Nucleic acid binder design. Sequence first.
DNA 1: CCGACGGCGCATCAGC
DNA 2: GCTGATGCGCC
DNA 3: GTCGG
Length: 326
Amino acid sequence: TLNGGITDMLTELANFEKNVSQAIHKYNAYRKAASVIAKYPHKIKSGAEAKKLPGVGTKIAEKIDEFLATGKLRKLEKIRQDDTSSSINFLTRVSGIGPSAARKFVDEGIKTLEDLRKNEDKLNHHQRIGLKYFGDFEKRIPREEMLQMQDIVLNEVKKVDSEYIATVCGSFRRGAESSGDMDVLLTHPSFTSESTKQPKLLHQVVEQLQKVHFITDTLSKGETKFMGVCQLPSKNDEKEYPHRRIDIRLIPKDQYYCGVLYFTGSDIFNKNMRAHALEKGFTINEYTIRPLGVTGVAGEPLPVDSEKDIFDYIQWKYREPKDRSE
DNA sequence: CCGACGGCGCATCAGC
DNA sequence: GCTGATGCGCC
DNA sequence: GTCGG
Ligand SMILES: [Cl-]
Ligand SMILES: [Cl-]
Ligand SMILES: [Cl-]
Ligand SMILES: [Mn+2]
Ligand SMILES: [Mn+2]
Ligand SMILES: [Mn+2]
Ligand code: NA
Ligand code: NA
């Protein structure tokens, strides 16, 4: 981690702008620079050297020089010492509490974990569960556990209907040795871009995972996207495994490639890639890649039979999932 | 100097 | 009930 | 906050 000190600083600045400033573009700018710097293969000696990188500008170069000189940034030193900012940043670590709700809670005098615990009745469902598992959700998932979880989901899904295909994406598919959570893309030939011949396709699967006590809680759910909690089973006399986040996204089967591109990420890889498509006259979503017409509007879906096809359209050499960890 | 910055699912709420 | 705005979430 | 035009 050649420039861990700098990228940590930028990440902290990004979080501040998002959770406290509510300046979402500053948030995206900081994350973009942190990312471009993380992959830069030299130990950075000056801001001017970082500025040569796209995404790193004058302001970030200045902060980089301060950080290399002193080992800190005064701006962040002060943000840390600010009670309202610290509280707001903390509350936003609970799933379901964002910048708006965090500020509101701080206003009402709710600003710690203990305050939250005694004011459970002030939380919506999602927040209640986010709080319930606050500690567990901060732990990472070793790839070995991800492999155990994969086997359970794929095997249980098989038991509902052999025609389902479940694919674990997210950092797992990019080959990470540890994951923040588990993301599962689901397809079934009853659900395509042209028709929904079978209702309840996602629910059925959620039910089955709930039946075997894998899924333990639900944050939100609809016809195509489930967001909840899950837990691996423990052996006799062994400590319980931590509760984990799970996301399941049902995608039309004929649009699997755009879907697996989306759900593989990273999030920054996706932003970068979709921005580039626009520059080249295309717009990409989890469903389709389409042409931009002369006016502002998108054309019919272009044919796609591979992830690589999407890269071709926008004139990018193909990138393996393992190299999409931006 | 400026305008754009990726795209979209689910929960909640205000107005009708 | 509907619809659109907003929040929070996903990668 | 950074970028292209
Ligand atoms: Cl902003
Ligand atoms: Cl610092
Ligand atoms: Cl589409
Ligand atoms: Mn994930
Ligand atoms: Mn996830
Ligand atoms: Mn994520
Ligand atoms: Na630059
Ligand atoms: Na949160």
